[PDB]
């Protein structure tokens, strides 16, 4: 199931080619990546790093996930956080964006390991 989870992780959180950082980028990507299909996803982060840079976070020392498990890892990466404004409903979802290079936390599973969940 880690391959279905890994694929959903890429679609929802990975975009190496762009740098984003604007409301317009959130409005476009949230839609293109299928997160406003039936409802406006309240909050989402996009990681602007190479796929191998992110799979490589799985190899760092283990830390606690918000759920108690110890299969989470951290890394400082360029991201764009998109927050729903609440003005409208799907499919016309409007977001506000914040850009930064910050510490993120992801869950890795399988052998070999792959990112299967974005913790925080």
Curated annotation (Swiss-Prot):
Task performed by this protein: Cleaves preferentially after uridine bases. Has antimicrobial activity against uropathogenic E.coli (UPEC). Probably contributes to urinary tract sterility.
Binding site for dUMP: 8, 13, 41, 44-45, 118
Lineage: Eukaryota, Metazoa, Chordata, Craniata, Vertebrata
Source superkingdom: Eukaryota
Disulfide-bonded cysteines: 26-82, 40-93, 58-108, 65-72
Residues bearing PTM Pyrrolidone carboxylic acid: 2
Keywords: Antibiotic, Antimicrobial, Disulfide bond, Endonuclease, Hydrolase, Nuclease, Pyrrolidone carboxylic acid, Secreted, Signal
Name under which the protein is recorded: Ribonuclease 4
Localization in the cell: Secreted
Tissues of expression: Expressed in the cortical and medullary tubules of the kidney, and in the transitional epithelium of the urinary bladder (at protein level).
Membrane-spanning segments: none
GO cellular component, one term: extracellular region
Entry similarity comment: Belongs to the pancreatic ribonuclease family.
Keyword Nucleotide-binding belongs to the record: no
Single annotated GO MF: RNA nuclease activity
Gene Ontology biological-process entries: antibacterial humoral response; defense response to Gram-positive bacterium
């Amino acid at each position: 199931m880690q391959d279905g989870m890994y694929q959903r992780f890429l679609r929802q959180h990975v975009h190496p080619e762009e740098t984003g950082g604007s409301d317009r980028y959130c409005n476009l990507m949230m839609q293109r990546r299928k997160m406003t299909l039936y409802h406006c996803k309240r909050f989402n982060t996009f990681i602007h790093e190479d796929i191998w840079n992110i799979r490589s976070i799985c190899s760092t020392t283990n830390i606690q996930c918000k759920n108690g498990k110890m299969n989470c890892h951290e890394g400082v990466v360029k991201v764009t956080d998109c927050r729903d404004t609440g003005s409208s409903r799907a499919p016309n979802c409007r977001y506000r964006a914040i850009a930064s290079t910050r510490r993120v936390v992801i869950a890795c599973e399988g052998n070999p390991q792959v990112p299967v969940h974005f913790d925080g």
